Design a protein around this ligand. Structure first.
Ligand SMILES: CC(C)Nc1ccc2cnn(-c3cncc(-n4ccc(CC(=O)O)c4)n3)c2c1
Length: 334
């Protein structure tokens, strides 16, 4: 309509799924097999969301501790898909492992039996960390991101509560994948995904032509909080204040340029809201309280991540080939 808008495309795996069997991305056509519950004794309920309840369980057959989740047939679509995706991920570094899709004849409803990892909530955890114990998980976390990205998939919801971490042992597993989806070269994607603290700026202007990049802003948000000490860093209010909380960091001007870059009329409102703020040196957040966590690296890596242009951001991999993570000879030396 008068006032066209280019659009975007994945800058990295922009065409992956295509050069692939339809079977693959056609999850609406994915009829997975199921198992009973009976084989599983749901010990203690860890959590649950709007559609899924989540318990700690153990496979009766072989006293093996495991995690299980269930969720009414809200949209056999989501369900259908969530499954295909996960099978399509299994065997992926730091990617939650889907043990087996079973339908607890309990209600005669489907459930997932995920591997079990001993999570310790970032709340307590995100404070004992260290310049090291951070680069370490980020990178780790990343290895996950880049992998699902490499496989044409953008989780669509990055946040602490989806990033378990066994600090004792020392492992990371980006659990969950119920909001994720497939990435095909240009497709208006609901913008109503993610959380009111990570949802990227892009998903504020209701800009659907997003991609893997989204998985990075989030990843961006954590890092900052992890490095500076704010949780969340952009602790927003109205799904709209969440745009200003940012605006004050990336810049009000710098912002428009972005919406100019992609023909975007900023919904009214923000007018009264926004104001005229100017990009803030990330140093404007480094005080005693976090002095030891920061460093030029994180500030560097951080600037190239938390950016408006949902395109000009570091890639899932580039991230890993970035300096800040050098401190990790990534156990693999060859
Ligand atoms: C349940 C999630 C939302 N949060 C949560 C909250 C408290 C806790 C405590 N431990 N814990 C936990 C531990 N191991 C595995 C999973 N798990 C395996 C897959 C999924 C869920 C999935 O992958 O969808 C979760 N969750 C929690 C996990």
């Amino acid at each position: 309509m008068p006032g066209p808008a280019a659009g975007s495309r994945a800058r990295v795996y922009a065409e992956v799924n295509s050069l692939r069997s339809r079977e693959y991305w056609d999850y609406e056509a994915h009829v997975p097999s199921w198992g009973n519950q009976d084989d599983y004794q749901l010990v203690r309920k860890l959590g649950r969301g709007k559609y899924s309840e989540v318990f700690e369980a153990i496979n009766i057959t072989n006293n093996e501790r495991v995690v299980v989740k269930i969720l009414k047939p809200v949209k056999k679509k989501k369900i259908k898909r969530e499954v295909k995706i996960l099978e399509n991920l299994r065997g992926g570094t730091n990617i939650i492992k889907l043990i087996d899709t079973v339908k607890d004849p309990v209600s005669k409803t489907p459930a997932l039996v995920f591997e079990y990892i001993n999570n310790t909530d970032f709340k307590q955890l995100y404070q004992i960390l260290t310049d090291f114990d951070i680069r370490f998980y980020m990178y780790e976390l990343l290895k996950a991101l880049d992998y699902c990205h490499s496989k044409g998939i953008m989780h669509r919801d990055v946040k602490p509560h989806n990033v378990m971490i066994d600090h004792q042992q020392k492992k990371l597993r980006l659990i969950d994948w119920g909001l994720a989806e497939f990435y095909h070269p240009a497709q208006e994607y609901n913008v109503r995904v993610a959380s009111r603290y990570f949802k990227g700026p892009e998903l504020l202007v209701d800009y659907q032509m997003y991609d893997y990049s989204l998985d990075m802003w989030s990843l961006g948000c954590m890092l900052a909080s992890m490095i500076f000490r704010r949780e969340p860093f952009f602790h927003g209010q109205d799904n709209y204040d969440q745009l200003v909380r940012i605006a004050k960091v990336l810049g009000t001007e710098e912002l428009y340029g972005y919406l100019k870059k992609y023909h975007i009329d900023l919904d009214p409102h923000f007018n009264d809201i926004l104001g005229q703020h100017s990009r803030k040196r990330w140093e404007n957040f480094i005080h005693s309280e976090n002095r030891h966590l920061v460093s030029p690296e994180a500030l560097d890596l951080l600037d190239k991540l938390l950016r408006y242009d949902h395109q000009q951001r570091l890639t899932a991999k580039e991230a890993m080939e970035h300096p800040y993570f050098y401190p990790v000879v990534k156990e693999q030396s060859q």
